[PDB]
Design a protein around this ligand. Structure first.
Ligand code: CAC
Ligand code: CAC
Ligand code: ZN
Ligand code: ZN
Ligand code: ZN
Ligand code: ZN
Lengths: 329, 331
């Protein structure tokens, strides 16, 4: 209630501190890291890269990250536990389903999916005893029949446990509006929901309207930009060619509209990425060598330079994630 | 070759005995059994059902099964090792890819897939040290671009290791022809390849032509011809309308053409099945209560009463799988 689940166990909200609410240790597929660790060099290499990055993030002030990797994103909670302890950075794990559910998931009913999400929240992930502190879901512009089942199961699990829901959207297609409609039809409060990847669009009418309804707005891909990489089609398709300053200005824009309390900010970074083209991680690490420290090192001063008060920035990076993550019936 | 890798380690060809060459302990999805074991009741319950099933097949004469569950069929080799040890039945594990690869597989090149298949054959599966003894691949229609990559990677892994390739086809679409074409373009000998689910057609000329080219013909879904389930909206696509005796006669027909050495028979059974609609296992177990014992208890006697001599049935069930599974690069 005043405590949230992490991969090291329960912590009080006051311990969460500066929190990044949409991150990944490794973006992969179910079973993949354990079946083919050499894809990442080795499991050891991957863990060490994550520990170095989390430590640099910690140096820059980060105390908690939320790993929104689901089952079908190849979430390995044992890896999360290992790197969280070695970095001494809190990591909140996720249940839910992303965009790559296997047959054994996509043939399930809303009731079955509800039970799977509840298992991971109430009992534990796999046989680790580690409990999810958030439910991650994903849709593609026009919500598919299966994706709708996932969103309803997520709402039902959220209503039963008080843990929040966070989403993947195509903001260019105003995806949050379809998601919100489903959530509310299940009686879920918007205060329990983050509409993510919302910095992918410059449509302020879309963002403010969701914010006005009490939704959290996930401006979570700030460092993603293929500017200077236009000759790389795969990188351009993934990162887009909007600048990080462009993305960041949306944070200021929503503050200026009076919605500072609805903003969540993150890097959507990762230290391995097998569910995309080979060597994409090298491209991303040259674009953003700061990794997950990009937000405190580059974005926060940018905003302070634009005249946003320190107290407002602290409220966005500490207070908002705390209110969001804290299980609330 | 001389030794075949199993989930308990290497065995000599003579130790293999009566072998079922296309089976599953559990048809699932990668990561699924460990993330949601309660879907099967529990891991323990699934394990215990498999051990009873394998002990029943063993009492009917079976000594080895080949579990052709791939990574994306949620193969759990630790489970296979457990069940194998408790049932005293050899289990050969598979590498390769079936029809549900995740993004991290679907985005890989033929060269990368080759490395993955090779790691599972040469080094081991996951961190278990258990090595695959067969490469399983699957196609639909006229073979998709990704499936062609898988078949080529499988051929390359087979050529580097001598381990055979076994396939999932749509026999009604003569799917084996396109698979064979791809394998032969890679310089793979047809004697290293089993074209599976071949009993799901009545087109004997299609099967005979493949056997003539030296392919192994996998007659492996004999008990799936259901009969009685046209009211069910899922038991005609996974099961059948024909009778099992009709399928079984395909075996005799190939024997009579002189291709007994090209025949492999199996049940394609399983003890859990999460990659389908809920409760399908109850439907399947009710239609075929023999499970993996269907072949030795029903099909072998049926063939014997159709005039097939003991030496021929033993060649098919013992000799052919031994020759197939023994790692070889000598055509
Ligand atoms: C794993 As992602 C690029 O949907 O945040
Ligand atoms: C796992 As199957 C039904 O293709 O043999
Ligand atoms: Zn996303
Ligand atoms: Zn993400
Ligand atoms: Zn098959
Ligand atoms: Zn099969």
């Amino acid at each position: 209630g005043d405590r949230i689940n992490t991969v090291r166990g329960p912590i009080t909200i006051s311990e969460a501190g500066f929190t990044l609410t949409h991150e990944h240790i490794c973006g992969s597929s179910a079973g993949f890291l354990r079946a083919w660790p050499e894809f990442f060099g080795s499991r050891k290499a991957l863990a060490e890269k994550a520990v170095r990055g989390l430590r640099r993030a910690r140096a820059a002030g980060v105390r908690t990250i939320v790993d929104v990797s689901t089952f079908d994103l190849g979430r390995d909670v044992s890896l999360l536990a290992e790197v969280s302890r070695a970095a001494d950075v809190h990591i909140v794990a996720a249940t839910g389903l992303w965009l790559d559910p296997p047959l054994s998931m996509r043939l399930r009913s809303v009731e079955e999916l509800t039970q799977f999400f509840l298992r991971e929240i109430q009992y534990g992930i796999e046989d680790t005893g580690i409990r999810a502190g958030i439910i991650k879901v994903a849709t593609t512009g026009k919500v598919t029949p299966f994706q709708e089942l996932v969103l309803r199961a997520a709402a039902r699990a959220s209503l039963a446990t008080g843990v929040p829901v966070t989403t993947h959207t195509a903001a260019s297609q105003r995806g949050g509006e379809q998601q919100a409609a489903i959530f509310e039809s299940e009686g879920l409060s918007p205060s329990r929901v983050c509409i993510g990847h919302s910095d992918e669009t410059d449509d302020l009418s879309y963002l403010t309207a969701l914010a006005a309804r009490g939704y959290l707005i996930g401006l979570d891909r700030i460092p993603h930009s293929a500017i200077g990489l236009e000759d790389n089609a795969s990188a351009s398709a993934l990162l887009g060619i909007r600048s990080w300053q462009t993305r960041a200005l949306l944070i200021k824009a929503l503050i200026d509209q009076g919605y500072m309390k609805q903003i969540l900010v993150s890097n959507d970074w990762l230290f391995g990425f097998s569910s995309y083209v080979t060597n994409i991680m090298d491209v991303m690490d040259s674009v953003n060598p700061d990794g997950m420290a990009f937000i405190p090192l580059r974005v926060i001063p940018f905003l302070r330079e634009k005249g946003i008060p320190q107290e407002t920035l602290a409220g966005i990076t500490v207070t908002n994630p705390a209110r969001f993550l804290s299980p609330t019936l």
